[PDB]
Structure formats: C-alpha cells, structure tokens
PDB file of C-alpha atoms (C1' of nucleotides) and ligand atoms in Angstrom:
ATOM      1  CA  UNK P   1     130.047 -64.035 204.289  1.00 18.32           C
ATOM      2  CA  UNK P   2     131.008 -67.708 204.988  1.00 15.28           C
ATOM      3  CA  UNK P   3     128.009 -69.642 204.146  1.00 16.62           C
ATOM      4  CA  UNK P   4     124.456 -67.977 204.486  1.00 15.88           C
ATOM      5  CA  UNK P   5     123.632 -64.712 202.359  1.00 14.53           C
ATOM      6  CA  UNK P   6     123.576 -61.461 204.467  1.00 13.00           C
ATOM      7  CA  UNK P   7     123.569 -57.996 203.635  1.00 12.86           C
ATOM      8  CA  UNK P   8     127.147 -57.938 203.983  1.00 10.69           C
ATOM      9  CA  UNK P   9     127.418 -60.459 201.368  1.00 10.69           C
ATOM     10  CA  UNK P  10     128.591 -59.182 197.845  1.00 10.87           C
ATOM     11  CA  UNK P  11     126.769 -60.257 194.992  1.00 14.53           C
ATOM     12  CA  UNK P  12     128.163 -63.348 192.834  1.00 14.60           C
ATOM     13  CA  UNK P  13     130.448 -62.369 189.887  1.00 15.00           C
ATOM     14  CA  UNK P  14     129.662 -63.371 186.176  1.00 12.41           C
ATOM     15  CA  UNK P  15     130.523 -66.990 185.774  1.00 13.50           C
ATOM     16  CA  UNK P  16     128.495 -68.521 188.848  1.00 10.86           C
ATOM     17  CA  UNK P  17     125.403 -69.540 186.962  1.00 12.40           C
ATOM     18  CA  UNK P  18     127.140 -71.893 184.638  1.00 12.74           C
ATOM     19  CA  UNK P  19     128.947 -73.892 187.699  1.00 12.09           C
ATOM     20  CA  UNK P  20     125.957 -73.665 189.931  1.00 12.57           C
ATOM     21  CA  UNK P  21     124.309 -76.861 188.914  1.00 11.70           C
ATOM     22  CA  UNK P  22     127.347 -78.889 189.964  1.00 13.33           C
ATOM     23  CA  UNK P  23     127.769 -77.118 193.010  1.00 15.98           C
ATOM     24  CA  UNK P  24     124.005 -77.507 194.146  1.00 15.83           C
ATOM     25  CA  UNK P  25     124.657 -81.279 193.429  1.00 14.01           C
ATOM     26  CA  UNK P  26     127.569 -81.287 195.626  1.00 17.36           C
ATOM     27  CA  UNK P  27     125.575 -79.502 198.295  1.00 18.30           C
ATOM     28  CA  UNK P  28     122.752 -81.868 198.293  1.00 18.46           C
ATOM     29  CA  UNK P  29     124.952 -84.898 198.910  1.00 18.37           C
ATOM     30  CA  UNK P  30     126.153 -83.231 202.064  1.00 18.07           C
ATOM     31  CA  UNK P  31     122.698 -82.783 203.641  1.00 19.62           C
ATOM     32  CA  UNK P  32     122.022 -86.598 202.952  1.00 20.69           C
ATOM     33  CA  UNK P  33     125.667 -87.167 204.607  1.00 17.38           C
ATOM     34  CA  UNK P  34     125.004 -84.841 207.450  1.00 13.58           C
ATOM     35  CA  UNK P  35     121.933 -86.538 208.863  1.00 10.68           C
ATOM     36  CA  UNK P  36     122.140 -89.462 211.267  1.00 12.71           C
ATOM     37  CA  UNK P  37     121.606 -93.099 210.262  1.00 13.18           C
ATOM     38  CA  UNK P  38     121.117 -94.817 213.309  1.00 16.14           C
ATOM     39  CA  UNK P  39     124.133 -97.098 213.100  1.00 12.87           C
ATOM     40  CA  UNK P  40     125.155 -99.667 216.057  1.00 12.84           C
ATOM     41  CA  UNK P  41     128.399-100.408 214.638  1.00 12.66           C
ATOM     42  CA  UNK P  42     131.526 -98.258 215.365  1.00 14.11           C
ATOM     43  CA  UNK P  43     133.043 -99.335 212.388  1.00 13.63           C
ATOM     44  CA  UNK P  44     129.927 -98.319 210.325  1.00 10.56           C
ATOM     45  CA  UNK P  45     129.588 -95.114 212.041  1.00 10.95           C
ATOM     46  CA  UNK P  46     133.164 -93.387 211.192  1.00 16.56           C
ATOM     47  CA  UNK P  47     132.567 -94.799 207.414  1.00 14.32           C
ATOM     48  CA  UNK P  48     129.686 -92.342 207.306  1.00 13.95           C
ATOM     49  CA  UNK P  49     132.438 -89.665 208.348  1.00 11.89           C
ATOM     50  CA  UNK P  50     134.611 -90.528 205.548  1.00 11.81           C
ATOM     51  CA  UNK P  51     131.768 -89.668 203.081  1.00 10.41           C
ATOM     52  CA  UNK P  52     131.930 -85.988 204.346  1.00  9.36           C
ATOM     53  CA  UNK P  53     135.751 -85.801 203.885  1.00 11.66           C
ATOM     54  CA  UNK P  54     135.571 -86.932 200.278  1.00 10.78           C
ATOM     55  CA  UNK P  55     132.487 -84.761 199.314  1.00 12.70           C
ATOM     56  CA  UNK P  56     134.325 -81.848 200.712  1.00 13.03           C
ATOM     57  CA  UNK P  57     137.482 -82.918 198.809  1.00  9.50           C
ATOM     58  CA  UNK P  58     135.639 -83.290 195.329  1.00 10.11           C
ATOM     59  CA  UNK P  59     134.127 -80.033 195.546  1.00 10.04           C
ATOM     60  CA  UNK P  60     137.369 -78.363 196.246  1.00 11.63           C
ATOM     61  CA  UNK P  61     138.948 -80.211 193.300  1.00  8.29           C
ATOM     62  CA  UNK P  62     136.266 -78.995 191.308  1.00 10.42           C
ATOM     63  CA  UNK P  63     136.943 -75.161 191.708  1.00 10.81           C
ATOM     64  CA  UNK P  64     140.699 -76.321 191.613  1.00 10.93           C
ATOM     65  CA  UNK P  65     140.491 -77.417 188.193  1.00  8.25           C
ATOM     66  CA  UNK P  66     138.464 -74.606 186.926  1.00  8.30           C
ATOM     67  CA  UNK P  67     140.947 -71.993 187.765  1.00  7.05           C
ATOM     68  CA  UNK P  68     144.169 -73.630 188.145  1.00  9.05           C
ATOM     69  CA  UNK P  69     143.970 -76.103 185.194  1.00  9.69           C
ATOM     70  CA  UNK P  70     141.113 -74.919 182.641  1.00 11.14           C
ATOM     71  CA  UNK P  71     140.976 -71.158 183.474  1.00  9.00           C
ATOM     72  CA  UNK P  72     137.378 -71.512 182.997  1.00  6.79           C
ATOM     73  CA  UNK P  73     136.471 -69.186 185.549  1.00  6.57           C
ATOM     74  CA  UNK P  74     137.659 -65.586 186.510  1.00  5.27           C
ATOM     75  CA  UNK P  75     139.729 -64.742 189.426  1.00  3.17           C
ATOM     76  CA  UNK P  76     136.997 -62.496 190.813  1.00  2.00           C
ATOM     77  CA  UNK P  77     134.653 -65.394 190.677  1.00  2.00           C
ATOM     78  CA  UNK P  78     137.555 -67.527 192.389  1.00  2.00           C
ATOM     79  CA  UNK P  79     138.035 -64.955 195.127  1.00  2.00           C
ATOM     80  CA  UNK P  80     134.277 -64.976 195.678  1.00  2.00           C
ATOM     81  CA  UNK P  81     134.127 -68.934 195.848  1.00  2.00           C
ATOM     82  CA  UNK P  82     136.827 -68.859 198.668  1.00  2.00           C
ATOM     83  CA  UNK P  83     135.229 -66.049 200.505  1.00  2.00           C
ATOM     84  CA  UNK P  84     131.739 -67.663 200.528  1.00  2.00           C
ATOM     85  CA  UNK P  85     133.414 -71.104 201.692  1.00  2.00           C
ATOM     86  CA  UNK P  86     132.885 -72.962 198.542  1.00  2.00           C
ATOM     87  CA  UNK P  87     136.551 -74.293 198.305  1.00  2.00           C
ATOM     88  CA  UNK P  88     138.859 -75.189 201.130  1.00  2.00           C
ATOM     89  CA  UNK P  89     141.685 -72.597 200.670  1.00  2.00           C
ATOM     90  CA  UNK P  90     144.286 -74.400 202.792  1.00  2.00           C
ATOM     91  CA  UNK P  91     143.660 -77.625 200.810  1.00  2.00           C
ATOM     92  CA  UNK P  92     144.169 -76.005 197.545  1.00  2.00           C
ATOM     93  CA  UNK P  93     147.447 -74.362 198.810  1.00  2.00           C
ATOM     94  CA  UNK P  94     148.727 -77.790 199.224  1.00  2.00           C
ATOM     95  CA  UNK P  95     147.679 -79.155 195.710  1.00  2.00           C
ATOM     96  CA  UNK P  96     149.801 -76.409 194.461  1.00  2.00           C
ATOM     97  CA  UNK P  97     153.010 -77.690 196.181  1.00  2.00           C
ATOM     98  CA  UNK P  98     154.969 -80.610 194.734  1.00  2.00           C
ATOM     99  CA  UNK P  99     154.293 -84.090 196.092  1.00  2.00           C
ATOM    100  CA  UNK P 100     150.946 -82.920 197.366  1.00  2.00           C
ATOM    101  CA  UNK P 101     148.807 -82.624 194.134  1.00  2.00           C
ATOM    102  CA  UNK P 102     146.722 -85.532 195.253  1.00  2.00           C
ATOM    103  CA  UNK P 103     146.375 -85.007 198.944  1.00  2.00           C
ATOM    104  CA  UNK P 104     143.196 -86.310 200.452  1.00  2.00           C
ATOM    105  CA  UNK P 105     143.053 -83.938 203.573  1.00  2.00           C
ATOM    106  CA  UNK P 106     145.167 -81.594 205.591  1.00  2.00           C
ATOM    107  CA  UNK P 107     144.897 -84.005 208.779  1.00  2.00           C
ATOM    108  CA  UNK P 108     146.735 -86.850 207.055  1.00  2.00           C
ATOM    109  CA  UNK P 109     150.113 -84.773 206.929  1.00  2.00           C
ATOM    110  CA  UNK P 110     149.924 -83.475 210.381  1.00  2.00           C
ATOM    111  CA  UNK P 111     152.950 -84.919 211.982  1.00  2.00           C
ATOM    112  CA  UNK P 112     152.144 -83.873 215.835  1.00  2.00           C
ATOM    113  CA  UNK P 113     148.991 -85.823 216.132  1.00  2.00           C
ATOM    114  CA  UNK P 114     150.560 -89.100 215.392  1.00  2.00           C
ATOM    115  CA  UNK P 115     152.168 -91.340 217.856  1.00  2.00           C
ATOM    116  CA  UNK P 116     155.238 -91.352 216.023  1.00  2.00           C
ATOM    117  CA  UNK P 117     155.727 -88.051 214.306  1.00  2.00           C
ATOM    118  CA  UNK P 118     154.963 -89.568 211.180  1.00  2.00           C
ATOM    119  CA  UNK P 119     152.708 -88.918 208.096  1.00  2.00           C
ATOM    120  CA  UNK P 120     149.629 -91.002 207.520  1.00  2.00           C
ATOM    121  CA  UNK P 121     150.131 -94.444 206.019  1.00  2.00           C
ATOM    122  CA  UNK P 122     147.846 -93.343 202.921  1.00  2.00           C
ATOM    123  CA  UNK P 123     150.503 -90.900 201.973  1.00  2.00           C
ATOM    124  CA  UNK P 124     153.071 -94.055 201.226  1.00  2.00           C
ATOM    125  CA  UNK P 125     153.154 -94.914 197.732  1.00  2.00           C
ATOM    126  CA  UNK P 126     151.727 -98.236 196.774  1.00  2.00           C
ATOM    127  CA  UNK P 127     154.727 -99.519 195.177  1.00  2.00           C
ATOM    128  CA  UNK P 128     156.513 -99.321 198.564  1.00  2.00           C
ATOM    129  CA  UNK P 129     154.018-100.852 200.650  1.00  2.00           C
ATOM    130  CA  UNK P 130     153.782-103.852 198.242  1.00  2.00           C
ATOM    131  CA  UNK P 131     157.611-104.207 198.683  1.00  2.00           C
ATOM    132  CA  UNK P 132     157.789-105.001 202.476  1.00  2.00           C
ATOM    133  CA  UNK P 133     154.733-107.098 201.798  1.00  2.00           C
ATOM    134  CA  UNK P 134     156.994-109.238 199.562  1.00  2.00           C
ATOM    135  CA  UNK P 135     159.360-109.661 202.555  1.00  2.00           C
ATOM    136  CA  UNK P 136     156.627-111.236 204.435  1.00  2.00           C
ATOM    137  CA  UNK P 137     154.393-113.211 201.986  1.00  2.00           C
ATOM    138  CA  UNK P 138     151.076-111.307 203.304  1.00  2.00           C
ATOM    139  CA  UNK P 139     149.581-108.910 200.736  1.00  2.00           C
ATOM    140  CA  UNK P 140     148.463-105.557 202.460  1.00  2.00           C
ATOM    141  CA  UNK P 141     147.101-105.280 205.951  1.00  2.00           C
ATOM    142  CA  UNK P 142     145.850-101.660 205.016  1.00  2.00           C
ATOM    143  CA  UNK P 143     142.713-100.653 203.136  1.00  2.00           C
ATOM    144  CA  UNK P 144     141.502 -97.368 204.485  1.00  2.00           C
ATOM    145  CA  UNK P 145     143.100 -94.457 206.332  1.00  2.00           C
ATOM    146  CA  UNK P 146     141.306 -94.149 209.713  1.00  2.00           C
ATOM    147  CA  UNK P 147     141.008 -90.251 209.348  1.00  2.00           C
ATOM    148  CA  UNK P 148     139.484 -90.306 205.936  1.00  2.00           C
ATOM    149  CA  UNK P 149     138.742 -93.652 204.288  1.00  2.00           C
ATOM    150  CA  UNK P 150     141.629 -92.974 201.943  1.00  2.00           C
ATOM    151  CA  UNK P 151     142.931 -95.961 199.766  1.00  2.00           C
ATOM    152  CA  UNK P 152     146.276 -93.912 199.281  1.00  2.00           C
ATOM    153  CA  UNK P 153     146.568 -90.146 198.387  1.00  2.00           C
ATOM    154  CA  UNK P 154     150.474 -90.326 196.883  1.00  2.00           C
ATOM    155  CA  UNK P 155     151.251 -88.643 193.626  1.00  2.00           C
ATOM    156  CA  UNK P 156     152.754 -91.426 191.615  1.00  2.00           C
ATOM    157  CA  UNK P 157     149.528 -93.384 192.583  1.00  2.00           C
TER     158      UNK P 157
ATOM    159  C1'   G I   1     150.733 -86.339 189.159  1.00  2.00           C
ATOM    160  C1'   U I   2     154.157 -81.966 188.759  1.00  2.00           C
ATOM    161  C1'   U I   3     159.192 -80.598 187.113  1.00  2.00           C
ATOM    162  C1'   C I   4     164.367 -81.027 184.894  1.00  2.00           C
ATOM    163  C1'   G I   5     167.399 -83.838 181.607  1.00  2.00           C
ATOM    164  C1'   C I   6     167.647 -87.419 177.450  1.00  2.00           C
ATOM    165  C1'   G I   7     166.025 -90.406 173.292  1.00  2.00           C
ATOM    166  C1'   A I   8     162.395 -90.762 168.991  1.00  2.00           C
ATOM    167  C1'   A I   9     157.906 -89.831 166.341  1.00  2.00           C
ATOM    168  C1'   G I  10     154.214 -86.512 163.559  1.00  2.00           C
ATOM    169  C1'   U I  11     153.972 -80.907 162.836  1.00  2.00           C
ATOM    170  C1'   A I  12     157.729 -78.520 162.145  1.00  2.00           C
ATOM    171  C1'   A I  13     162.440 -71.345 161.294  1.00  2.00           C
ATOM    172  C1'   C I  14     163.314 -76.904 166.674  1.00  2.00           C
ATOM    173  C1'   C I  15     157.554 -75.135 168.064  1.00  2.00           C
ATOM    174  C1'   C I  16     153.232 -77.937 169.640  1.00  2.00           C
ATOM    175  C1'   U I  17     151.578 -82.926 170.765  1.00  2.00           C
ATOM    176  C1'   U I  18     152.408 -88.209 171.663  1.00  2.00           C
ATOM    177  C1'   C I  19     155.192 -92.655 172.895  1.00  2.00           C
ATOM    178  C1'   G I  20     159.576 -94.843 175.319  1.00  2.00           C
ATOM    179  C1'   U I  21     163.439 -93.640 179.436  1.00  2.00           C
ATOM    180  C1'   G I  22     167.341 -91.236 184.164  1.00  2.00           C
ATOM    181  C1'   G I  23     166.894 -88.491 188.422  1.00  2.00           C
ATOM    182  C1'   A I  24     164.172 -85.066 191.563  1.00  2.00           C
ATOM    183  C1'   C I  25     159.820 -84.054 195.006  1.00  2.00           C
ATOM    184  C1'   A I  26     156.188 -86.873 198.552  1.00  2.00           C
ATOM    185  C1'   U I  27     157.080 -91.915 202.959  1.00  2.00           C
ATOM    186  C1'   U I  28     154.377 -96.356 207.529  1.00  2.00           C
ATOM    187  C1'   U I  29     147.187 -94.087 210.086  1.00  2.00           C
ATOM    188  C1'   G I  30     144.506 -96.299 213.992  1.00  2.00           C
ATOM    189  C1'   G I  31     143.124 -99.964 218.719  1.00  2.00           C
ATOM    190  C1'   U I  32     144.066-100.900 226.707  1.00  2.00           C
ATOM    191  C1'   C I  33     138.073-100.455 223.341  1.00  2.00           C
ATOM    192  C1'   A I  34     134.127-105.728 218.285  1.00  2.00           C
ATOM    193  C1'   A I  35     127.175-104.715 217.496  1.00  2.00           C
ATOM    194  C1'   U I  36     121.257-107.377 222.930  1.00  2.00           C
ATOM    195  C1'   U I  37     120.974-112.504 227.436  1.00  2.00           C
ATOM    196  C1'   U I  38     126.653-115.765 230.109  1.00  2.00           C
ATOM    197  C1'   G I  39     132.046-111.126 233.800  1.00  2.00           C
ATOM    198  C1'   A I  40     128.481-108.156 237.053  1.00  2.00           C
ATOM    199  C1'   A I  41     123.922 -99.704 238.106  1.00  2.00           C
ATOM    200  C1'   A I  42     120.698 -99.024 241.542  1.00  2.00           C
ATOM    201  C1'   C I  43     115.983 -98.436 243.402  1.00  2.00           C
ATOM    202  C1'   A I  44     110.498 -99.474 244.116  1.00  2.00           C
ATOM    203  C1'   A I  45     107.268-103.092 246.123  1.00  2.00           C
ATOM    204  C1'   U I  46     106.385-107.370 249.265  1.00  2.00           C
ATOM    205  C1'   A I  47     107.822-110.352 253.741  1.00  2.00           C
ATOM    206  C1'   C I  48     110.182-110.276 258.333  1.00  2.00           C
ATOM    207  C1'   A I  49     112.825-107.455 262.085  1.00  2.00           C
ATOM    208  C1'   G I  50     112.425-102.574 264.758  1.00  2.00           C
ATOM    209  C1'   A I  51     115.291 -96.690 265.957  1.00  2.00           C
ATOM    210  C1'   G I  52     121.373 -95.763 272.407  1.00  2.00           C
ATOM    211  C1'   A I  53     121.867 -94.855 277.757  1.00  2.00           C
ATOM    212  C1'   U I  54     117.112 -95.963 281.832  1.00  2.00           C
ATOM    213  C1'   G I  55     112.681 -97.348 286.675  1.00  2.00           C
ATOM    214  C1'   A I  56     110.668 -94.329 282.261  1.00  2.00           C
ATOM    215  C1'   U I  57     111.202 -90.539 278.139  1.00  2.00           C
ATOM    216  C1'   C I  58     114.648 -87.555 275.931  1.00  2.00           C
ATOM    217  C1'   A I  59     119.517 -83.219 273.737  1.00  2.00           C
ATOM    218  C1'   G I  60     123.516 -85.073 272.323  1.00  2.00           C
ATOM    219  C1'   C I  61     129.468 -85.258 271.201  1.00  2.00           C
ATOM    220  C1'   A I  62     133.296 -88.631 270.381  1.00  2.00           C
ATOM    221  C1'   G I  63     136.900 -92.721 270.318  1.00  2.00           C
ATOM    222  C1'   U I  64     137.859 -97.952 268.273  1.00  2.00           C
ATOM    223  C1'   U I  65     137.174-101.516 262.848  1.00  2.00           C
ATOM    224  C1'   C I  66     140.895-105.059 256.855  1.00  2.00           C
ATOM    225  C1'   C I  67     132.696 -99.698 257.635  1.00  2.00           C
ATOM    226  C1'   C I  68     130.048 -96.343 254.283  1.00  2.00           C
ATOM    227  C1'   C I  69     126.504 -92.579 251.933  1.00  2.00           C
ATOM    228  C1'   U I  70     125.169 -87.151 251.146  1.00  2.00           C
ATOM    229  C1'   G I  71     128.196 -82.970 250.203  1.00  2.00           C
ATOM    230  C1'   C I  72     132.849 -78.145 246.720  1.00  2.00           C
ATOM    231  C1'   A I  73     134.341 -79.608 251.561  1.00  2.00           C
ATOM    232  C1'   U I  74     139.407 -80.157 256.860  1.00  2.00           C
ATOM    233  C1'   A I  75     131.838 -77.799 257.326  1.00  2.00           C
ATOM    234  C1'   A I  76     127.445 -80.077 258.692  1.00  2.00           C
ATOM    235  C1'   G I  77     124.031 -84.373 258.360  1.00  2.00           C
ATOM    236  C1'   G I  78     123.108 -89.664 257.803  1.00  2.00           C
ATOM    237  C1'   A I  79     119.204 -94.552 264.079  1.00  2.00           C
ATOM    238  C1'   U I  80     123.699 -89.753 269.412  1.00  2.00           C
ATOM    239  C1'   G I  81     125.274 -92.606 260.727  1.00  2.00           C
ATOM    240  C1'   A I  82     126.623 -98.395 261.037  1.00  2.00           C
ATOM    241  C1'   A I  83     129.477-102.330 263.430  1.00  2.00           C
ATOM    242  C1'   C I  84     131.583-103.217 268.420  1.00  2.00           C
ATOM    243  C1'   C I  85     128.854-103.945 274.840  1.00  2.00           C
ATOM    244  C1'   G I  86     130.255-111.378 273.511  1.00  2.00           C
ATOM    245  C1'   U I  87     134.330-114.955 275.472  1.00  2.00           C
ATOM    246  C1'   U I  88     137.928-115.255 279.211  1.00  2.00           C
ATOM    247  C1'   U I  89     142.827-121.103 283.466  1.00  2.00           C
ATOM    248  C1'   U I  90     150.298-122.393 283.211  1.00  2.00           C
ATOM    249  C1'   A I  91     157.082-116.874 282.737  1.00  2.00           C
ATOM    250  C1'   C I  92     154.465-120.525 287.961  1.00  2.00           C
ATOM    251  C1'   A I  93     156.942-121.702 292.889  1.00  2.00           C
ATOM    252  C1'   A I  94     158.330-121.751 298.130  1.00  2.00           C
ATOM    253  C1'   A I  95     156.742-124.140 303.326  1.00  2.00           C
ATOM    254  C1'   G I  96     154.567-128.567 305.526  1.00  2.00           C
ATOM    255  C1'   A I  97     151.194-132.951 306.559  1.00  2.00           C
ATOM    256  C1'   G I  98     149.518-137.592 305.302  1.00  2.00           C
ATOM    257  C1'   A I  99     149.608-141.738 302.275  1.00  2.00           C
ATOM    258  C1'   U I 100     151.955-144.807 298.794  1.00  2.00           C
ATOM    259  C1'   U I 101     156.861-146.458 297.603  1.00  2.00           C
ATOM    260  C1'   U I 102     162.542-148.168 296.575  1.00  2.00           C
ATOM    261  C1'   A I 103     168.950-149.077 296.997  1.00  2.00           C
TER     262        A I 103
HETATM  263 MG1   MG N 201     129.075 -91.826 265.433  1.00  2.00          MG
HETATM  264 MG1   MG N 202     127.465 -87.025 263.168  1.00  2.00          MG
HETATM  265 ZN1   ZN N 203     143.402 -87.437 205.060  1.00  2.00          ZN
HETATM  266 ZN1   ZN N 204     145.421 -90.716 205.920  1.00  2.00          ZN
HETATM  267 ZN1   ZN N 205     144.859 -89.928 202.235  1.00  2.00          ZN
END
RNA sequence: GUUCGCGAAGUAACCCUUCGUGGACAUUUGGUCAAUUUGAAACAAUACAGAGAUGAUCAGCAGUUCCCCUGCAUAAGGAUGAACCGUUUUACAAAGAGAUUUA
C-alpha cells in the first residue's frame, strides 16, 4: 500500500478524480528528476537532488492546503493519500506547529547531524542574517542550503 | 506565516473583513575534497641479461638488510622469493747492532 496498487490496496475515495490531474503532473516531473543527466561537476550533481527535495515539498503542500486550509477534501481521502504515500506525514506534522509553517524538509531541523548541534542556516530569518552583514559590509555569503537548495524557509520570511 | 493583545475603518445586537501597531513562536548548513594533459596505478610487447651449492645434476630450511609481492593468515608459496659471497695496515713497544751527529 505505499506506492504500487496491489490486492491489499483499498479503492480510492470520492474526491480523488478532481485532484488527480495535479498529482499526475507532479508525478511526471519526478520521473524527469530521477533519471541521470550525466554531469561532470560536483556542484551540478547535488543541484539535481535539490529538485527532488523541492518537488516532494510542493506535492505535500498541495494536499496540506486542500485539507487543513481549504477543506476541499474529506478526511477519508486524506487518510488514503497518507497511506498511499502521496503526502509526507512527518512533514505535514511540522507544518501544523508554530514556527515551522514553511519548513523545507526534516533534514534541516535535525540537530544531531550538524557539526555544532545547530539548525540549518536556512532556518535563520533573513532580517537577522542581513544584520551581522551590516557589521562587516559584505552582503550574504549564503545562497542555498546544502541539503535542500533552500533560500530560507523561516516563517517571517 | 500562525496566535495573543491594542488602535481604526466598512458591515455592523460588537460580528465578519481590511489597514496600521506591541509581544510571543522559529535561529547560523556545508568543505582536509573545484570539472581531461603539468604533483605522479600498473601491466603487456620489444631489447639485453639468465634461474644457489658443484667435478656435474638436484630436495630444500633458515639467519642478516633504512627489501618486498600473493594470501584471512602468527599457514604456505613467490629463482632454496630478492639483495648480501666485495674490501681489509697504528691502544703499539721492549732488547740489540751499525752508521750519522752534538754540549
Ligand atoms: Mg629465503
Ligand atoms: Mg620460502
Ligand atoms: Zn531542508
Ligand atoms: Zn537547510
Ligand atoms: Zn530550508
């Protein structure tokens, strides 16, 4: 029941046909992303992986707004879309929290993985990174987060 | 972006939107590493040389070196694995004899 339809898979509920054209359009953008473009550069190669983290994030904001913001789908369709692995359950669970409404991924708040026990730089608000920049006179030595290619996922931002 | 409070607007049995404000929430990724010739795989082929002792042909096993390869290996193999089988003058005098030689 995660991804391919088997006999143990339950039939889809009512509102799935109206959301299915957008979910098919995310699905074919991942297939172009999965394939290897033969890239010599190390900086181009993780740039391809950032497209996968973004395409994953956007399809989960799609199902999140349909149920928690617009209420356009029944809960029986939402429980089906979680079990059939359309929407990332643990990512939606942070989006419900306060301060985490626009979080890019779960790997960027995971403190144990960092050298310093900190969050990712993409979690720091753009007002604050501009401030110590004014101390130095140099703008920003930060463009994209190494694990996501996130330009800053903070709430105020 | 959410939420709490505040100040207004319009709708208004004070409710719904919208604008202006205070506080809260959330807080510093990654690299010892840049994408062909100029910071360092190897082999095969070719050319030369030829794989111990001995009168001669052979089983080998060691030790020594700022020598290794194969192997999980403290096993066993790798020409008995390889390189060593070259060069070597003073802790130095005692005894005597001749000759030279000087107060
Ligand atoms: Mg030997
Ligand atoms: Mg041997
Ligand atoms: Zn992230
Ligand atoms: Zn990040
Ligand atoms: Zn981020």
